[PDB]
Ligand binder design. Sequence first.
Ligand code: MG
Ligand code: MG
Ligand code: MG
Ligand code: MG
Length: 309
Amino acid sequence: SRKKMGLLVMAYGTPYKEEDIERYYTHIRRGRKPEPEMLQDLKDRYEAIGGISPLAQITEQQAHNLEQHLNEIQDEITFKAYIGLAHIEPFIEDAVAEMHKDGITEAVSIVLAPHFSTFSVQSYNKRAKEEAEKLGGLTITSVESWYDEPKFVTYWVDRVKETYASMPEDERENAMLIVSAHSLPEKIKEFGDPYPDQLHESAKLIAEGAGVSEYAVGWQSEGNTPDPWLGPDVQDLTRDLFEQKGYQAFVYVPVGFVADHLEVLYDNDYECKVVTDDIGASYYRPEMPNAKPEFIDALATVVLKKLGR
Ligand SMILES: [Mg+2]
Ligand SMILES: [Mg+2]
Ligand SMILES: [Mg+2]
Ligand SMILES: [Mg+2]
């Protein structure tokens, strides 16, 4: 009766253990192994945020919770989740191969990044579908974006409202909300990539839903290829906006990220906090979705909507 489907949950990835950081970094660097000092600097960043070990566990918990919740809220499909990561084991291809081995013939995929981009989501979905094509007898339908799912917007609206209500009056009336996602090369716009437009729309939805009077859109975690990356960077944006108007509180909503990973714990909670401490402003960064029920329900709704169910 009740049919079985694979649930392919994809993400950029974080190593599960320190010994895999070098191979992760090499993958991200397109085969160029980091020099030893560069490797140690990355290791030191994971140490600085309390250790790498908790990070991969969040993605595990998200996939686990999403399977369980999807299987409780409807009876037509029994999902089995498989995690496929872009840059470290289990790779996207490994997950699809495991689905196929397990007898899955039909799967739905979702990327744990709400905005579509040609560099991330589209590439992950193509990798998944190419592996399925090689194995045969398995097809995948893929979610491309979900930033506009109302339950996801409401997660962030509610967290942002909570944070502003937490503030003393003078911060409330002199605060700036910075909404961000992972930078990519500006060149994606020459392929018509809507990624920046979707980040701006997330910011608009969240700011207006939360009743925030002043907000700005920034990017974080850019790379180092010489051609321009989407900007401004959140560190620069923070200072710039302070230099204009003297905000005494900054609230960071790294809406492009779904978990407490290095880009949030280091690039927001360390690098942006350095800047807010320097200028005398308070720092706030509301809880990331992680594996909390409200967020899992938002993702389950995304998946069921994709299937028309
Ligand atoms: Mg190994
Ligand atoms: Mg293979
Ligand atoms: Mg859509
Ligand atoms: Mg950086």
